[PDB]
């Protein structure tokens, strides 16, 4: 369907391509800022009762990228049938173990039809060593550090399908707060920092009962086909245990996901997001 | 007298009815092969040994339908013997002579060969017009190498059979014993004399006592073997287990975290391994010629198709992932499926390969079970938050606090337990001769698997456990007569340090010419999954997944010791070859190999295991080998993330392709950053005996010409910036010029018609993996 | 508790040749695509903190009034004491040298450098209040 799309530009490197639960965590830091505690109540409410966010993906000069479903590794000897037979090996296992597709390969996987994948990934994940000196006497004492690097003309994206009066005065003016902030890693080298804009995306989807989640979800029940992705986080200097959540492209059947709340011993609850994104998408046999 | 059972004469019977081969190709008895090998075996029976190898002798004696044919002859021979000497039945000892009989026509297809030829060799699985000669499985003293000698003079067959002589002779008759003789003598030689014959003796013996031993515990008597059904009915049961996710399992650690315990999870991993494969071989009471493969993370078992026995695997592989996910949360996971399969789906039957059909629905089952990662837990998605979960700072494991130890080496660190364990595992790797299994609540228990624990056996200590799991030999030494005898290999060399130990980081970066950085190796082989489906019979997988592995369990340890220096040449080298190379190898599965070490020696590695490997095969499979140097401070998560998104790299482009070093490129599509194998040793052999003469030294009256090579690099990168030559062709022939030197590269100079008209680079691009590597290496 | 961002925007101009450095021998840091230089903002930022701890270590008699974290900091560092903090101004070792980094929020809210800066602490945090963006 029409979704929103919201483009966030980087201003430098980013620590990791921020998942679902930590846009959410980043978005409900900036309602609490601005608005105070009595709107993240009701933040959270309409993500309950309505909207739904994804995880952030990466796009290249007008070309969004979307994960690639879990589908298409059942039936891929079925997708290419009509290929010959001497590169049909090669041709699979590369298929096979990309990650990303654009709007044109990927409404090709969901209806199980041929794709490609693309050739050049928009971002590097870069080793920069640091150091640290003694004050005094400056003796060097270096460590490693991680960040991602964007192409000139490359960034971030992730996708909102809610009402237009909750994205109005809840998602875009987080947006604009977690631009001067950072958005997850060590925002006070300047990384996580971007410029917003604001499109309007459309993904032509399969009716079916089955769907793939563009977000990780936390399950309620046991899913078809999936990725565990287990990771946990950190609330205000408090660290939050490892769940099990499920990736962006797992495949679900009529599975809403459900939004977890931690009691953490903190002033307040830590809700983390865990909620599906659905595409309708059709299964092998 | 002595009580025998049935599963051990069938077992054993078909692990020897082609024993008369050997000993028929070496001209001793004159006789039909069944002939001479049942006279081989009465006359084993009358020197010291057992008494059941007159019974024995049954087996080979008649397991041809010619021989067979009788059913009166068979009858008498037995009243001429006695079966009840050894408990045996009547019925029950007529019945295995059928069971070894059909057995020998699944093993392999039955095409009769009329005369055998007179003594052609064993022709290699990777190149069918090629043969091996005859030598001893050692790996030691020769690297087999498929040449073009053709035939086998009848003095070392005879040479064979008097050291075969002696060895069944001090084994006590079972089958664990039975196999590691079989396996050092008869590897190197042909089942069925003919042109083009690929399957070795050894494993056309190993996998007919497979399916008699499968066929046996089914419950196919005689007459269903004279009738059919059982190559019409799903009577066996192709088992195959995956291990996923175990680059995630081994290179997860921090900056905590030695190599010394780097190289301990990778022990642990082969022990898990072996634990859940011994286990389904007791339950289902196999033995270990049913286990077609073991190497890296992924068997097949050939087993039979009961109710019975599908109630055992459904539990095997519960409590397994059970164990598994409570041990180490969603990092490594097994997928265990079994097909059930029929005779005919044996072999070839109406011109298709009906086997290579069967695995490929195997195979299928593999996938879709990877994509379910842990749905047999019931608790897996369900969330329990009981309070105070610590981690662990040299893995990741989350725990609940309070189970973190004090460590041996830091005490102000809290590590998990099993990271307490693996450390002292890493203290005694250079003085351990293998593992024995026993129950997991006994004393001495330093690694625990799913299903057993197992106690580490020292150089100088007696082993305890139920069966023995002993490392890189096929000789069995100061171990109980019923401890189990399992031999594994392993590539297992590392560089010692002054003490006994695994050498550091630390002791690897240094002695490295040039600059100290550490180098890392990853590779495998490539297309190696067509490769194992082209066979036809399970004695053909049985051969090719067998040398297929030897190369990197046995064989790549001779190459870092110089050996085999004939075959391999002249490789792009820094220095001369030292006697003991600061080389660790971490991991060296069937197509895989992770190895660090100095990264003047990580880089001549690379190109002396190619060259080695272009002639273990028939250059038919070749390698695709990522380099890599790095820091030496750097996490082994993050050294491992680099090569492996360094060696796809050098995989998706053309497949047979090095990656050397970091490259600069300009983004046109027709620059790939990774050199062809015979590309960059035609660059070495050019460009590098001009300008360096090793040892970190260049070549005379080009002393004090450091800065020099920088600036042919600087030049390179107008290249990168923007091609067609904008104004690099006569800068090169102006730095050239002002020196006096102009022999040093000509190509470098003039623009290169050969490459335009084909769309290739120049030939100043391809410059930077040779000059950039003489430059480390003459850093200091 | 928040109120707004003042922001600083301006030119860094190298009036003399600038080298930081990565490990031509000795390349300085650059972008990993365009290949062009460029100033990290954890070398900005870390210079900012170093000259400012300096200023603070000097002057730690006469700001007490004013920041009353100061009071428990005599100068120098704890180098000659291989032991955490007690009493010297560069207290906090992070792997072989020494710093300046309290070791509370309430402690980190009244020192001139950590209320700015930033502070890690053991069992409270302080984070920073400035960004350095490259
Ligand atoms: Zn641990
Ligand atoms: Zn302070």
Redesign the interface.
Same mark, same amino acid.
């Given at each position: 369907p029409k979704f929103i799309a919201v483009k966030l530009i980087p201003k430098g490197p980013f620590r990791d391509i921020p998942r679902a639960d930590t846009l959410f965590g980043a978005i409900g830091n900036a309602i609490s800022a601005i608005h105070g505690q009595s709107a993240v109540e009701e933040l959270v409410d309409a993500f309950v009762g309505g909207a739904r966010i994804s995880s952030a993906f990466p796009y290249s000069g007008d070309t969004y990228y979307l994960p690639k479903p879990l589908s298409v590794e059942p039936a891929l000897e079925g997708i290419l049938t009509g290929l010959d037979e001497e590169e049909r090996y090669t041709t699979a296992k590369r298929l096979r173990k990309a990650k990303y597709l654009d709007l044109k390969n990927f409404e090709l996987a969901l209806r199980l039809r041929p794709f490609t994948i693309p050739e050049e990934i928009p971002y590097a994940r870069v080793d920069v060593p640091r150091v640290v000196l003694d004050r005094v006497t400056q003796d060097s004492s270096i460590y490693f550090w991680e960040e991602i690097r964007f192409r000139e003309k490359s960034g971030v994206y992730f996708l909102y399908s809610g009402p237009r009066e909750v994205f109005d005065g809840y998602i875009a003016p987080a947006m604009r707060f977690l631009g001067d902030t950072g958005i997850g890693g060590k925002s006070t080298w300047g990384a996580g920092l971007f410029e917003v804009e604001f499109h309007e995306m459309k993904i032509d989807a399969p009716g079916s009962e089955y769907s793939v989640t563009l977000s990780n979800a936390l399950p309620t029940k046991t899913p078809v086909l999936w990725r565990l992705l287990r990771k946990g986080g950190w609330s205000f200097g408090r660290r939050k245990p490892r769940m099990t959540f499920i990736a962006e492209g797992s495949i679900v059947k009529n599975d809403p996901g459900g939004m977890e709340r931690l009691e953490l011993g903190l002033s307040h609850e830590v809700y983390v997001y865990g909620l599906t994104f659905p595409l309708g998408v059709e299964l092998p046999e | 007298q002595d009580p025998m059972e049935i599963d051990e004469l069938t077992a054993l019977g078909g692990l020897l009815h082609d024993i008369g081969k050997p000993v028929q190709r070496a001209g001793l008895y004159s006789g039909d092969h069944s002939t001479q090998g049942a006279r081989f075996l009465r006359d084993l029976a009358e020197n010291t040994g057992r008494a059941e190898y007159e019974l024995l002798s049954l087996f080979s004696e008649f397991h041809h339908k010619g021989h067979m044919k009788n059913d009166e002859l068979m009858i008498r021979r037995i009243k001429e013997l006695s079966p009840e000497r050894f408990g045996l039945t009547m019925e029950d000892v007529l019945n295995a002579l059928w069971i070894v009989y059909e057995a020998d026509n699944l093993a392999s297809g039955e095409r009769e060969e009329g005369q055998p030829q007179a003594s052609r060799p064993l022709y290699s699985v990777f190149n069918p017009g090629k043969a091996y000669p005859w030598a001893e499985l050692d790996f030691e003293k020769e690297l087999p190498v498929p040449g073009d000698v053709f035939s086998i003079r009848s003095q070392d067959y005879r040479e064979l059979v008097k050291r075969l002589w002696e060895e069944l002779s001090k084994a006590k008759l079972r089958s664990d014993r039975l196999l590691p003789v079989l396996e050092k003598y008869l590897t190197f030689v042909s089942s069925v004399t003919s042109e083009g014959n690929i399957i070795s003796l050894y494993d056309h013996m190993r996998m007919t006592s497979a399916i008699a031993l499968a066929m046996l515990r089914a419950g196919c008597t005689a007459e269903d073997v004279r009738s059919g059904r059982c190559r019409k009915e799903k009577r066996f049961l192709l088992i195959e287990g995956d291990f996923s996710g175990i680059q995630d399992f081994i290179y997860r650690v921090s900056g905590k975290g030695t190599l010394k315990y780097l190289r301990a999870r990778s022990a642990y991993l082969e022990l898990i391994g072996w634990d859940v494969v011994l286990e389904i071989l007791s339950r289902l009471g196999l033995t270990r010629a049913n286990v077609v493969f073991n190497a890296g993370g992924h068997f097949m078992i050939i087993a039979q198709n009961t109710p019975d026995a599908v109630k055992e695997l459904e539990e095997i592989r519960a409590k397994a992932v059970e164990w598994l996910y409570r041990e180490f !949360?969603?990092?490594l996971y097994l997928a265990i499926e079994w097909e059930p399969v029929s005779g005919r789906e044996f072999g070839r039957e109406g011109g298709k390969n009906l086997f290579a059909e069967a695995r490929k629905r195997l195979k299928?089952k593999l996938?879709?079970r990877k994509?379910?990662?842990?749905?047999e837990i019931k608790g897996?998605?369900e969330?329990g938050?009981t309070?105070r979960?610590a981690?662990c700072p040299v893995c990741g494991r989350?725990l609940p606090e309070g189970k973190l130890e004090p460590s041996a080496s830091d005490p102000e660190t809290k590590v998990c337990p099993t990271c307490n364990r693996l450390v002292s595992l890493g203290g005694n790797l250079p003085k351990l001769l293998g593992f024995g299994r026993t129950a997991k609540n006994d004393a001495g228990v330093l690694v625990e698997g799913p299903f057993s624990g197992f106690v580490p056996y020292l150089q100088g200590g007696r082993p305890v456990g139920e069966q023995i799991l002993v490392k890189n030999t096929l000789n069995p030494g100061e171990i109980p007569e019923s401890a189990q005898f399992v031999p594994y290999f392993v590539a297992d060399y590392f560089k010692k340090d002054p003490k006994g130990g695994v050498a550091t980081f630390e002791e690897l970066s240094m002695a490295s010419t040039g600059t100290r950085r550490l180098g890392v190796m990853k590779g495998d082989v490539d297309?190696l999954?067509?490769f194992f489906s082209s066979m036809d019979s399970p004695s053909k997988l049985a051969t090719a997944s067998r040398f297929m592995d030897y190369f990197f369990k046995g064989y790549i340890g001779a190459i870092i010791e110089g050996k085999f220096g004939y075959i391999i040449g002249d490789v792009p080298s820094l220095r001369d070859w030292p006697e003991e190379p600061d080389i660790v190898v971490v991991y060296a599965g069937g197509d895989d190999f992770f190895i660090v070490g100095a990264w003047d020696q990580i880089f001549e590695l690379a190109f002396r295991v190619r060259r080695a490997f272009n002639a273990y095969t028939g250059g038919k499979l070749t390698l695709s080998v990522g380099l890599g140097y790095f820091?030496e401070?750097?996490?082994i998560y993050?050294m491992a993330?680099?090569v492996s998104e360094r060696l796809?790299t050098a995989k998706?482009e053309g497949?047979n392709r090095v990656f050397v070093v970091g490259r600069?490129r300009p983004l046109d599509?027709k620059h790939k950053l990774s050199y062809e194998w015979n590309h960059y040793e035609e660059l070495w052999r050019t460009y590098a005996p001009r300008i360096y003469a090793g040892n970190g030294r260049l070549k005379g009256k080009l002393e004090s010409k450091k800065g020099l090579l920088?600036k042919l690099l !600087?030049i390179r990168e107008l290249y990168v910036r923007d091609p067609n030559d904008v104004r690099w062709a006569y800068l090169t022939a102006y730095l050239l010029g002002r020196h006096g030197l102009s022999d040093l590269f000509p190509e470098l100079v003039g623009i290169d018609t050969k490459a335009v008209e084909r769309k290739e680079p120049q030939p100043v691009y391809w410059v930077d993996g040779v000059l950039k590597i003489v430059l480390m290496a003459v850093?200091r | 508790r928040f109120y707004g961002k003042i922001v600083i925007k301006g030119k860094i101009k190298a009036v003399t040749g600038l080298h930081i450095g990565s490990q031509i021998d000795n390349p300085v840091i650059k972008d990993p695509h365009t290949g062009l230089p460029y100033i990290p903002g954890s070398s900005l930022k870390g210079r900012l903190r170093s000259l400012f701890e300096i200023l603070v270590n000097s002057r730690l008699g006469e700001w007490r009034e004013k920041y009353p974290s100061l009071a428990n900091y005599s100068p120098g560092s704890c180098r000659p004491d291989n032991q955490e903090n007690c009493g010297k101004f560069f207290n906090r070792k992070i792997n072989r040298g020494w710093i300046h980094v309290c070791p509370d929020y309430e402690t980190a809210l009244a020192c001139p450098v950590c209320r700015l800066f930033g502070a890690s602490g053991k069992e409270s945090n302080f984070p920073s209040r400035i960004i350095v963006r490259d």
């Open positions: - | !949360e969603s990092d299928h996938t879709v994509l379910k990662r842990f749905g897996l998605f969330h938050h309070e979960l981690e989350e297309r999954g067509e820091d401070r750097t996490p993050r993330d680099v796809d998706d497949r600069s599509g920088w !600087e850093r | -």
